Amino acid sequence: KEMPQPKTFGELKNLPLLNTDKPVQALMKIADELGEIFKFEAPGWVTRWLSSQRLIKEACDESRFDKNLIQALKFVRDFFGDGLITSWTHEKNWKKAHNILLPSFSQQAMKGYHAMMVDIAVQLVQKWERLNADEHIEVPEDMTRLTLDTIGLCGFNYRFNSFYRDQPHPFITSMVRACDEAMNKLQRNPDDPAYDENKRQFQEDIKVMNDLVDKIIADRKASGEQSDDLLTHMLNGKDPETGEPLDDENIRYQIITFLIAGHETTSGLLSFALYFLVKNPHVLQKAAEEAARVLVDPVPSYKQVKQLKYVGMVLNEALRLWPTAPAFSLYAKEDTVLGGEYPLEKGDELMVLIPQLHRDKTIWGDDVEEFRPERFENPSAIPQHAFKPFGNGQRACIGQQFALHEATLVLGMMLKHFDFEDHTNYELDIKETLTLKPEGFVVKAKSKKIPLGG
Ligand code: HEM
Ligand SMILES: C[C@]12CC[C@H]3[C@@H](CCC4=CC(=O)CC[C@@]43C)[C@@H]1CC[C@@H]2O
Ligand SMILES: C[C@]12CC[C@H]3[C@@H](CCC4=CC(=O)CC[C@@]43C)[C@@H]1CC[C@@H]2O
Ligand SMILES: [Cl-]
After folding, report:
1. Neighbours of 214 (CB within 10 A)
2. Please, which residues have CB within 8 angstroms of residue 120's CB and are 6 or more apart in sequence?
3. Which ligand is nearest to the CA of 319?
4. 3-state SS string over the chain?
């Protein structure tokens, strides 16, 4: 059997089809046309895109497939090194870092992070209480302020102070400018001297990111207070399987890795959640009644956040529709056959298209486009490998609980303290970098004038 494949363009193959700002959304349309699996090929690489739970469930068998880092994106590996997201499972520093950092995401870790999450969430709420009547909120912008600050403080006892800035922190601006520059070069005569300033600017941006990391470490060595946080574990934690802590080189990569991965997809999630709420007033009202019922104190306790059941369903359902890291990659460990129809040679690449997996009518029913948090009412009824916003198996998201606790806390406080109005009747416009975010999403928030504790 031939595997489906969209149209080719000489020896550019399918590559011209990604001549777009929204390639993941373009790939979803192709998935709609061609079905559960299709080959997609470019000059320097080939892969197969999977969209059905039946094939993805096989792809997620770790005895047969492991995590792949895509060659086309080596600029990422360049910058994040052998940090946890950009290391191969077989690499030494993957397992070492994994075992050293897992305890930083334990239940006792989360309880320890809670008060500092609240510190940043109170800042977000206060910003919004202080807006004049004529004004509105820039939602992804403010969610990015919250998430960057929350990972900075909880993780590294460093304050980005993003709510004290009108534009994004220099780290974000440099991050976005670096990772944009690197991505544009994929289709560059890249060595043309016309691009020299592009390369000089790229250098300046890595130097901002690197100075920040240095400050974080230096502040920590100098510190007078006791921290037991993510950075504490990076510095001092020892690999049980061998007794050594990470070296300085790898630690630097973990810091940059956690600063970035630890904020971006969480800001997207909050933004999409708020979008879906304001487009679904009955759901908003239900989420709001919960918030008001559960958050009875002036600030939320860890336990109260665990009781926001419906807010958690809201978040899972936003991650169903628009998983903010929308794809991951796998390779075949040995020759094997997928779905009893598609032969694969050792090393062959697969891509999981998460948003399309999440619209598999076989699994979810026909109403896959509706925003229905009630689907997660009973979470053990969702088949295995049907819902994968946090990836797979031993290479699944280490920060998953951190992300959901932060998001639930913040969304709960937002819904306690304000009524939200989609005052422009916003039309969803999804911007794609390596993640997904609504662009230009704005709302008004009318305060309920509920005082906010310290
Ligand atoms: C809604 C929020 C988030 C989503 C949707 C998300 C998604 C993902 C996905 C899909 C992967 C697997 C990548 C792959 O297969 O190539 C992953 C891995 C990872 N995430 Fe997240 N993530 C989120 C939040 C966070 C947070 C808050 C942190 C850190 C505090 C974090 C740190 C990581 C790390 C370190 C990995 C690599 C795990 C390993 O291989 O050892 N993420 N995430
Ligand atoms: C984009 C991202 C950093 C880089 C990750 C991405 C998801 C998975 C992934 C696979 C790769 O092969 C390169 C690195 C990437 C592309 C991460 C999820 C959140 C973070 O912002
Ligand atoms: C989906 C993705 C963004 C879109 C990427 C995709 C890898 C394949 C690819 C190559 C490109 O050069 C741009 C578009 C795409 C199609 C990326 C893998 C992780 C990231 O989230
Ligand atoms: Cl509150």
Report:
1. 12
2. 146, 149, 150, 153
3. 1
4. CCCCCCCCCHHHCCHHHHCCCCHHHHHHHHHHHHCCEEEEEECCEEEEEECCHHHHHHHCCCCCEEECCCHHHHHHHHHHCCCCCCCCCCCHHHHHHHHHHHHHHCHHHHHHHHHHHHHHHHHHHHHHHCCCCCCCEEHHHHHHHHHHHHHHHHHHCCCCCHHHCCCCCHHHHHHHHHHHHHHHHHHCCCCCHHHHHHHHHHHHHHHHHHHHHHHHHHHHHHCCCCCCCHHHHHHHCCCCCCCCCCCHHHHHHHHHHHHHHCCHHHHHHHHHHHHHHHHCHHHHHHHHHHHHHHCCCCCCCHHHHHHCHHHHHHHHHHHHHCCCCCEEEEEECCCEEECCCEEECCCCEEEEEHHHHCCCHHHHCCCCCCCCHHHHCCHHHCCCCCCCCCCCHHHCCCCHHHHHHHHHHHHHHHHHHEEEECCCCCCCCEEECCCEEECCCEEEEEECCCCCCC
What angle is formed at CA 322 by the lines to CA 279 and CA 260, rounded to 5 degrees?
A: 120
- Reference 303, options 170, 111, 445, 163; nearest CA is 111
| 60 among known catalytic residues | no
Ligand nearest to the CA of residue 448, numbered in listed order: 4
Q: Whose CA is nearest to atom 40 of ligand 1?
A: 395
Binding residues for heme: 397
Q: Of the candidates 26, 71, 32, which has an alpha carbon nearest to the alpha carbon of residue 348?
A: 71
| Domains, the chain, with CATH or none | 1-454 (1.10.630.10)
Name the token pair of 288: 């709001």
Sign of the alpha-carbon torsion through 13, 17, 23, 28: negative
CA geometry: angle at 399 spanning 394 and 401, to 5°?
Answer: 105
Pocket of ligand 2, candidates 75, 76, 253: which has the most ligand atoms within 8 Å of its Cβ, to mutate? 76
Q: Interior CA angle at 67 toward 65 and 313, to 5°? A: 100
Of all protein residues, the one whose alpha carbon is nearest to atom 8 of ligand 2 is 328
* Residue 326, CA distances (Å) to 22, 329, 421, 435, 437 in order: 12, 11, 28, 7, 11
The yes-or-no answer on residue 397 being catalytic is yes
Q: After which residues is the chain broken (C to N over 2.5 A)?
A: 188
Name the residue among 375, 328, 379 with its Cα closest to residue 355. Answer: 328
Please, which residues have CB within 8 angstroms of residue 78's CB and are 6 or more apart in sequence? Answer: 182
Binding site, by residue number, is 67, 94, 395, 397
Report helix angle 92-101 to 248-261, nearest 10.
70
